[PDB]
Amino acid sequence: MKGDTKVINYLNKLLGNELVAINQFFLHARMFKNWGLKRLNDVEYRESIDEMKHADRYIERILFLEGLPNLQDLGKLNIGEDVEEMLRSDLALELDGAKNLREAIGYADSVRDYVSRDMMIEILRDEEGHIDWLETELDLIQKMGLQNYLQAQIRE
Amino acid sequence: MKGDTKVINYLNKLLGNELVAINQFFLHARMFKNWGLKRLNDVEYRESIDEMKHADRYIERILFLEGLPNLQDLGKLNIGEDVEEMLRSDLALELDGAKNLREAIGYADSVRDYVSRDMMIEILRDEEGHIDWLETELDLIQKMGLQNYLQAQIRE
Ligand SMILES: [Zn+2]
Ligand SMILES: [Zn+2]
Ligand SMILES: [Zn+2]
Ligand SMILES: [Zn+2]
Ligand SMILES: [Zn+2]
Ligand SMILES: [Zn+2]
Ligand SMILES: [Zn+2]
Ligand SMILES: [Zn+2]
Numbered sequence: 001m002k003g004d005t006k007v008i009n010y011l012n013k014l015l016g017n018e019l020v021a022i023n024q025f026f027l028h029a030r031m032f033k034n035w036g037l038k039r040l041n042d043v044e045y046r047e048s049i050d051e052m053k054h055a056d057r058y059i060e061r062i063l064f065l066e067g068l069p070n071l072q073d074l075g076k077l078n079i080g081e082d083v084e085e086m087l088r089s090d091l092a093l094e095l096d097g098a099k100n101l102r103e104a105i106g107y108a109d110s111v112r113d114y115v116s117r118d119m120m121i122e123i124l125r126d127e128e129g130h131i132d133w134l135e136t137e138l139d140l141i142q143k144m145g146l147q148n149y150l151q152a153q154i155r156e
Numbered sequence: 157m158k159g160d161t162k163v164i165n166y167l168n169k170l171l172g173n174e175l176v177a178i179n180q181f182f183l184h185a186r187m188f189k190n191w192g193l194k195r196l197n198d199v200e201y202r203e204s205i206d207e208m209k210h211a212d213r214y215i216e217r218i219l220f221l222e223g224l225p226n227l228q229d230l231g232k233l234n235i236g237e238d239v240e241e242m243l244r245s246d247l248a249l250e251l252d253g254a255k256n257l258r259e260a261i262g263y264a265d266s267v268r269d270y271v272s273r274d275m276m277i278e279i280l281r282d283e284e285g286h287i288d289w290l291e292t293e294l295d296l297i298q299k300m301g302l303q304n305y306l307q308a309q310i311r312e
């Protein structure tokens with residue numbers, strides 16, 4: 001069906017967020033693996049699967065709405081140079097992405113695009129879990145200090 | 157070992173090219189699948205595996221050289237609105253990426269970073285194959301006209 005123009009615009013924006021997140025995951029996972037940080041690597045990998053699914057859903061919805069994927073400028077990634085900077089950068093991305101997603105959800109709801117709204121609601125639930133994980137690891141880094149946090153990742 | 161600063165810079169640039177290409181593949185493959193274009197979908201998917209491997213190699217080399225992945229601004233993708241525009245956009249990316257890669261190969265060679273040079277030489281061989289495919293499909297589109305080309309993709 002021909003979708004709402006502004007919904008399709010939101011979906012394109014959100015798809016670009018997902019792609020940026022995937023890009024940043026691709027680098028982080030490998031950095032963590034190189035440092036021996038198995039648990040951080042594994043969480044990054046699992047969350048990347050989620051983000052790919054999100055991106056899949058966006059493209060399918062855009063195409064079903066007779067729109068075409070068309071990305072905004074995705075910008076410069078802030079990769080980070082140490083584990084705290086990396087996770088803090090992820091948190092920044094994830095908080096902005098959740099803000100965008102709430103805006104889109106409200107808008108889709110307001111114009112009776114309930115299928116788009118419901119899709120986005122599911123994605124947001126996943127993103128809130130990503131945020132919770134990040135915030136929790138960053139709180140540990142503050143409590144323990146980064147070096148002590150890194151040393152606690154080392155497996156018996 | 158501590159690598160050459162400018163080599164690491166090149167590797168970062170080339171990694172960003174790979175990420176852009178992967179992003180564009182993620183969209184194109186799904187567009188093609190939605191249009192029923194099985195053979196184009198399949199080639200895009202196979203080439204995306206190559207690009208991911210390339211990106212893997214770059215990150216590993218940067219890390220082995222004691223550098224850190226650090227991406228340039230990757231910009232706005234030109235997705236295209238029809239199959240010719242999509243493949244032409246891919247060709248543009250791939251030609252620029254090959255130009256960058258020859259520059260880096262020459263530089264790495266010149267400063268005796270032969271391991272980096274040899275890695276890039278392998279990647280370039282793959283990229284030249286991507287270029288050949290694109291150019292060949294685009295020549296068919298010119299010869300046949302886009303619509304007749306699209307109709308010839310439809311399976312008996
Ligand atoms: Zn990360
Ligand atoms: Zn996501
Ligand atoms: Zn997320
Ligand atoms: Zn701190
Ligand atoms: Zn393509
Ligand atoms: Zn490549
Ligand atoms: Zn390529
Ligand atoms: Zn033409």
